Amino acid sequence: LNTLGDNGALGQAPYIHLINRDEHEQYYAVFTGSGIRVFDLSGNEKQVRY
Amino acid sequence: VIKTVLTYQLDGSNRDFNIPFEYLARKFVVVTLIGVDRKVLTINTDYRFATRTTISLTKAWGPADGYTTIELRRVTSTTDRLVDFTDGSILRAYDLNVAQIQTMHVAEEARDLTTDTIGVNNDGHLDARGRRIVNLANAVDDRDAVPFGQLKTMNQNSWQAR
Amino acid sequence: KTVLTYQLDGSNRDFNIPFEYLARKFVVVTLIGVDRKVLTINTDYRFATRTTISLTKAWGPADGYTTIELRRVTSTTDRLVDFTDGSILRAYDLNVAQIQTMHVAEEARDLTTDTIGVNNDGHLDARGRRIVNLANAVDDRDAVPFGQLKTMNQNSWQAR
Amino acid sequence: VIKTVLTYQLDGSNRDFNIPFEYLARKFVVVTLIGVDRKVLTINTDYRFATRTTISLTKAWGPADGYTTIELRRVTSTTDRLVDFTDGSILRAYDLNVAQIQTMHVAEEARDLTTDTIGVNNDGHLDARGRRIVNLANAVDDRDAVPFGQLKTMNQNSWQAR
Amino acid sequence: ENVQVLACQSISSDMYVILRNEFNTFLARISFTKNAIDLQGEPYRAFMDMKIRYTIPSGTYNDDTFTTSIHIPTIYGANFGRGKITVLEPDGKITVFEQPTAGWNSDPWLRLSGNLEGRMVYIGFNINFVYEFSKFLIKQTADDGSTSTEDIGRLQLRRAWVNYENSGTFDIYVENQSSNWKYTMAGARLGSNTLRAGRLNLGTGQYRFPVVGNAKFNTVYILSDETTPLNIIGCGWEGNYLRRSSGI
Amino acid sequence: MRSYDMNVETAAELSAVNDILASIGEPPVSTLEGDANADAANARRILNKINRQIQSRGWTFNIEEGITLLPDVYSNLIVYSDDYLSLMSTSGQSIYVNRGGYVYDRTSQSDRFDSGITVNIIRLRDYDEMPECFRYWIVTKASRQFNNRFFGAPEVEGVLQEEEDEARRLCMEYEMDYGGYNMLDGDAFTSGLLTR
Amino acid sequence: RSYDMNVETAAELSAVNDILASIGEPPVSTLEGDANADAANARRILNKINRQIQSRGWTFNIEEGITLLPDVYSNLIVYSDDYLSLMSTSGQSIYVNRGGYVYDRTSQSDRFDSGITVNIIRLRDYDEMPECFRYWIVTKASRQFNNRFFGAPEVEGVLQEEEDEARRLCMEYEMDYGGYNMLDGDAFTSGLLTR
């Protein structure tokens, strides 16, 4: 589907949760030990404000 | 060691000769009566295939006619391929087996025709294993080898100039 | 028909290739093999169009080479068609494989011709002909064409 | 780019030997010990395949016995095919590949053998194709029509004859 | 061994997976639909890891070498380390490339013979499918749903087979104590009306492969790294059984 | 030897049909490219095998006594082709055998011949050339072998055994009718005695 | 069509025929990396049967005046495994295999300086055998393969019958080949015909 990072984007031990909201707004959140990177199921990263 | 070229003595009345080599068509057999001059025979005119693996000449063609031997040789084709695969084909053994057989037959014909033992290049250079060429030779071009006739002419010029 | 020796008349430039190809890399050309010229494509070799050739440089006899051969050498290790268990076995692929494996034998037959002979008396024999082409020698243990025997003409001029 | 012979030199007493080419079976690799004659060494009596591409001999066979070259030629049979196809088989891809490999081995062996020869062309000209004729020492003797490199010194001598 | 799955949560029947190769992180989808096609134009639902629908661009084919080279980082957006990358064409022809000694990163080029400038191909990695049958022993079911294997009795000698449905090629390995044997099924028979040139070689039937052995020191497993589908219905075995060698 | 498919089908179609019927297999009508049948090639193989065996049995119509096998004049080698089912000599103990692929004179320990040898040879010939009785015997034996290799059917095996015995009886009758073989004036020893 | 291609017989068609003796299907390669557990087994059985049949002793495969040359340096003669039998031309054999070299029982010595003449049977390829012996070997191999692995009763019985028939044919072939005569042509009686 797509490429996310370069082996370090998600850290060593990220906790990943699937967001099945609606049939067109599926999101797949990744919680790295430092931040979060919510990548759409198509691989398009969504910039998450902090 | 040669399998694609056989030569049988005729000896007068003998109108049958065996075909040990394995051919892919009756068109790949060339009977060349050797003697005073080589002649090639045509199919079903003075040359017949009584059955596979044998020949049936119409005439004796003995030495009385000047021909001493008959050479049955194989000359597999190169431009025309006996097998042509198609999309709807069932791809049986005959097709690809004949393809490989034809290629290998051509290769061994090429190998046999050069059965003569000759100097083979050792490492990117032709070799003569210490064997020397002897007979007469001319040199009319810049790239030709040098015989010693030119060497002699040099000698007479040198010892006749003064 | 596979190995055709043409003449490098001064700047012949574009020569002709009469044999069909399978890949553009099966046409090996050499001026006169001395240093094992590789003659890479484009650099010093260029296919102007199919069944023709265009030399980048004139490469005349003055350069030391007076002929170029268009010998075809179909690769053996490199195969256009390779077979795999889970495949279709295209009819065209089978035909191409057969043609490729047959072109080697075609070259062998097109190159096989009445060859030299050896006589127990005197050693090697030539029946009674002369070498038409040969490479200038560099070792002191082999033959030499006229190209290395200009001293004969020099001495002839000196004598008279 | 790799020849099928790689002629060797004894250069004293040696046992281990190497081959550059690849063979389908060790029945298609001949080792003819040339030198005083065309002596050929068979298998199990003079041969030993310690491992692939490392043919070794029972003893040295040094030059003292009169043998100087052991060319390890490679010959693939054109009558005993490795894989012959049948209409009731499975058509393994390994079978098709083995068949093409053997046919290519037969043709490449028949193209290498014939290309290292001297003979006339369709125009009626035999060309060495720029292949230096090395190893022909003693060239000449009753006007044998070739030098072996002594021509340089002879012509140097004749140049300063005066 | 080079990849690290980070999560494989599925919605209804699609498993969305992130893989962490030593170079990049990939997001992939696995579909469990019974009879369907993942990507438009696929001939037979190719079983290929990282399957992608790639159209070769112009300027890759080179006449001088008769090769069509495609850069992997151009296909994907990352680099890979292992695996036998497989290329599939719309009809079904396959060109399998072995792993370069130094890995795919050093030599990420896929060189294909011929002019494939503007046509279509499916790229992806092979899937190593391994199944090992338990020892083929005399197993009998009691009145209820309990199975008892007959350990007592002479170590039997056998000969086995296997079935398949709409499958392709699968290798079968049988290993004894000392030696081993291999039987690759490839496709359909040679003279059959199912092995036509230019058409897919998928079929259904039964394959019988010899299994001569002791029935407990003889292991049989199926290997299939090809992209062609493989479905197995059942298996079996024929052998000779005696009542001896109760305890050795 | 030869592959089963190489020969064309003229009357071998009837023999193949009989072989396939010896097991119930319905009769094909092509025996050619349009076969796609696994039970037809496996019948032609049996037919060829049995034809070779029957020819090698040494019948009087294919002994062709008095051949003049000729050697290559540059190599001086005769070829013991696989088609040569049995090569022997007109006289007593024969001295010709097969070494490699060429005739070898064991007594002289040499396979180089100058003029040409005379032998009692049995050269393989197609199934069509066999007489009708021999064709029937070959078909029956091939049917028996096909049935007991592929299907079984012990009753069919017994019926084919009886048919094979009858066919062999007919073939022997044909051979004795063909040869003549008069023990007086036809024998190689007694005929001389009757000189009187 | 109109061609004369020759298919293999040396362990290639024989293996296929052995396989077809049972229900097995015909292979093609017989040397493919795939062990196949039937081409190997069929080849082993065929080779063993060929060796046994050759060792049985026949007119064509028995070589009468074969002379064996000892190694000059060691004065030893190697009793190769291919030497199926080794009997002296005379009535009494005096040569046996000790270690891996010929040993003279009566002389109790294996140091041969000149040489020996012996009736020797040497192993020869399967294809080199006549048609009768090829058929007998194939039938015996098929019967043994079946009996060892498949154990089909009816096939075993028919193959036993065919083995007996093949042996009869081979024996008649040998009798025809020898042309042995109890009159002139025999050793003891030929002398008596000096009347």
mmCIF file of C-alpha atoms in Angstrom, chain E residues 139-149:
data_model
loop_
_atom_site.group_PDB
_atom_site.id
_atom_site.type_symbol
_atom_site.label_atom_id
_atom_site.label_comp_id
_atom_site.label_asym_id
_atom_site.label_seq_id
_atom_site.Cartn_x
_atom_site.Cartn_y
_atom_site.Cartn_z
ATOM 1 C CA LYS E 139 -5.151 -44.199 13.151
ATOM 2 C CA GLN E 140 -8.591 -45.449 14.174
ATOM 3 C CA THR E 141 -11.502 -43.666 15.837
ATOM 4 C CA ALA E 142 -13.394 -45.193 18.755
ATOM 5 C CA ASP E 143 -17.161 -45.065 19.291
ATOM 6 C CA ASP E 144 -16.944 -41.456 20.490
ATOM 7 C CA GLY E 145 -14.758 -38.693 19.058
ATOM 8 C CA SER E 146 -11.486 -40.182 20.320
ATOM 9 C CA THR E 147 -8.691 -41.395 18.040
ATOM 10 C CA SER E 148 -6.199 -44.106 18.990
ATOM 11 C CA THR E 149 -2.993 -44.736 17.052
#
